[PDB]
Amino acid sequence: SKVCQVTGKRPVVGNNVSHANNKTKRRFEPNLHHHRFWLESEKRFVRLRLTTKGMRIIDKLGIEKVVADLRAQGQKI
Amino acid sequence: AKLKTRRGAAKRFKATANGFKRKQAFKRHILTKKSAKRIRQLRGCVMVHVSDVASVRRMCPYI
């Protein structure tokens, strides 16, 4: 399903609101996509399904820290 | 449950000692063509008519 591995983001529900104030159900979806990251400590590429905010967090903290954190939550990377 | 006030009527009527007071219509706009006497005599509050007092009481049970 559409879940970001780094942040846990998922689609949420909301409304389309028209000019006459008609309200209809809608969904907001994350900016999800697949990306390969080079893990040097393991000499391999890891493929993650994540968002652009996930990429920003990886840029901030390093891929090793993020991968260790995700493993600590029971994610089989 | 508790009786509920009709808020629209509550915004139009207030209680006096022996009745209800109200403002007068026809003073919101289109005022240039009206005579000075009508302008100054439609200004201020008057009393609610006895034929409408009962309806006002049912609409505003607590004032």
């Binding site: 080079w38 990429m55 840029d59 390093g62 | -």
Partner: protein
């Protein structure tokens, strides 16, 4: 992003210069291929602290 160049680059700078590059450039080319490192405090401590002279006389 801000990076410290591990080894010489044609236009960025030479052997330890700190430069700002577009995020994609560093994320996809420099960092995975070992031509630069992120300019964090720990990575800086690592770069000037010990391996600076090693990177230096590994000029080629």
């Amino acid at each position: 992003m801000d990076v410290i160049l591990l080894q010489r680059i044609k236009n960025l700078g030479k052997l330890g210069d700190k430069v700002s590059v577009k995020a994609g450039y560093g994320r996809n080319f420099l960092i995975p291929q070992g031509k630069a490192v992120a300019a964090t405090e720990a990575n800086t401590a690592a770069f000037e602290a010990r391996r600076a002279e090693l990177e230096k006389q590994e000029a080629e």
